[PDB]
């Protein structure tokens, strides 16, 4: 029997034996996270996760992976959000993310909560996921900023959002990317990611080495010179910090 490994540009991968139709279908298929250690092992159909259990990729021999199931009952499955449903299990955290980041009071004055690293990692490390409901750019761009605190463009046709009350960890903790605060000197970036549970979303990836307990920040990238109106389209707190920065140094 032959084994196929399909790596996504983000570092994650699908591995297992394919059927006659050459499809990733069976009870022994697995999605392996970017650390090439954490995995979701179980039932998949044509590469789509039906029932994946947390496991650890122990070793690989001639392309053949050996997994060891983690103790526990938590199960995961493809659960792509819609414009109204963010998740079937809002309180089930992502296992990879749970070992890399945590939420706490931000070190940035009056910035509420922030996202912090649990471990020291090197450059280009995926740390968190930015899942949320999927809505149009027209809907987002047509409403008050008060409702767009957590909106992130996925692509030309979709915007990901984490609307109230899901912006509270007590109501939603499946992903935590929306908890990272803004910085004009960020240590992370938002990057494309294909997640076995959340589907196509964005992730938070480090730009360089980060230490344990260091706050993770990303440049929100709001339009500073929007064509059609001489005024940076962004919330007040952003415009304030922007001026302070452009004057800082």
């Amino acid at each position: 029997h032959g084994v196929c490994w399909i790596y996504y540009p983000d570092g994650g991968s699908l591995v297992g034996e394919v059927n006659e139709d050459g499809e990733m279908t069976g009870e022994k298929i697995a999605y392996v996270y970017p650390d090439e250690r954490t995995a979701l092992y179980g039932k998949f159909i044509d590469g789509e996760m039906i029932e994946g259990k947390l496991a650890t990729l122990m070793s690989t021999e001639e392309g053949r992976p050996h997994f060891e199931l983690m103790p526990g009952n938590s199960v995961y499955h493809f659960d792509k959000s819609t414009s109204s449903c963010i998740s079937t299990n809002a309180l089930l955290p992502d296992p990879y993310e749970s070992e890399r980041v945590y939420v706490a009071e931000s070190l940035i004055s009056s910035a509420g909560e922030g996202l912090f690293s649990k471990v020291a990692v090197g450059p280009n490390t995926v740390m968190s996921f930015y899942n949320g409901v999927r809505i149009t750019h027209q809907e987002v761009d047509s409403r008050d900023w008060a409702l767009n605190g957590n909106t992130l463009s996925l692509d030309e046709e979709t915007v990901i959002d984490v609307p109230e009350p899901y912006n509270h960890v007590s109501k939603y903790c499946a992903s935590l990317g929306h908890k990272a605060n803004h910085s004009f000197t960020p240590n992370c970036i938002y990057d494309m990611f294909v997640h076995p549970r959340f589907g196509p979303i964005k992730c938070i990836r480090t730009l360089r080495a980060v230490e344990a307990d260091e706050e993770l920040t990303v440049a929100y990238g709001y339009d500073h010179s929007p064509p059609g109106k001489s005024g940076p389209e962004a919330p007040e707190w952003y415009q304030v910090e922007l001026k302070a920065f452009q004057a800082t140094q």
Binding site: D141, T151, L152, G221, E233
Partner: peptide
Amino acid sequence: TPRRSKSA
């Protein structure tokens, strides 16, 4: 003026 979401 139009875009009101993260990422530049």
